[PDB]
Design a protein around this ligand. Structure first.
Ligand SMILES: Nc1nc2c(ncn2[C@@H]2O[C@H](COP(=O)(O)OP(=O)(O)NP(=O)(O)O)[C@@H](O)[C@H]2O)c(=O)[nH]1
Ligand SMILES: [Mg+2]
Length: 179
């Protein structure tokens, strides 16, 4: 089996940058040249001296009807779902889509590891970080409870492509997919 890791979230949250930086060692400064993602981009990690994975980079979530992705088929084969959130922008909508994403996925596969990347933290005071994470952690788990889905576990990470934090976070995600 080849474990799948999904990169989801609203447009511009930094999904593609994360993929390029972490797996293609693209420089963080080069990500300024990336363009909006229009189709899902699958990039596999094969023959790993640790563990092989499929990395799916999704275009940002928008209210556009297109029942062509067969999400049940995607989630069924998913090991980890990373929801990326831009911490330097309003995230109320981000939280709302995280809720729909997580619950829809959980309905198909309860073994999915849900990882929340509170991204672009490089632009926050080393305290504003604590508050943002505390706020996202609180609301997200509160939404889950209001739905009777408190059992769904959400891990949170403070990340930035401008330092080791994004690698440290991705590392912990991959570790959890190695039996
Ligand atoms: N400050 C900061 N900027 C970041 C970080 N990660 C990405 N960015 C910036 O955010 C921009 C948008 O990133 P991008 O990867 O295109 O976002 P995306 O979610 O893939 N967008 P879409 O969903 O439209 O394809 C990048 O061009 C980059 O300059 C980060 O850790 N910190
Ligand atoms: Mg993208």
């Amino acid at each position: 089996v080849k474990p799948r890791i999904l990169l989801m979230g609203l447009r511009r949250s930094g999904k593609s940058s994360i993929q390029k930086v972490v797996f293609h060692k693209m420089s963080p400064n080069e990500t300024l040249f990336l363009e909006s993602t229009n189709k899902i981009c699958r990039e596999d990690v094969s023959n790993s001296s640790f563990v092989n994975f499929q990395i799916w980079d999704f275009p940002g979530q928008i209210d556009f009807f297109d029942p062509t992705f067969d999400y049940e088929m995607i989630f069924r084969g998913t090991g980890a779902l990373i929801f990326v959130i831009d911490s330097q922008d309003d995230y109320m909508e981000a939280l709302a889509r995280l809720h729909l994403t997580v619950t829809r996925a959980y309905k198909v596969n309860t073994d999915i590891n849900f990882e929340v990347f509170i991204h672009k933290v490089d632009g926050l005071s080393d305290d504003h970080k604590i508050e943002t994470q505390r706020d996202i952690h609180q609301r997200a788990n509160d939404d889950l409870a209001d739905a009777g889905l408190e059992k769904i576990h959400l891990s949170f990470y403070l990340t930035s492509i401008y330092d080791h934090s994004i690698f440290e976070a991705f590392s912990k995600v991959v570790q959890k997919l190695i039996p």
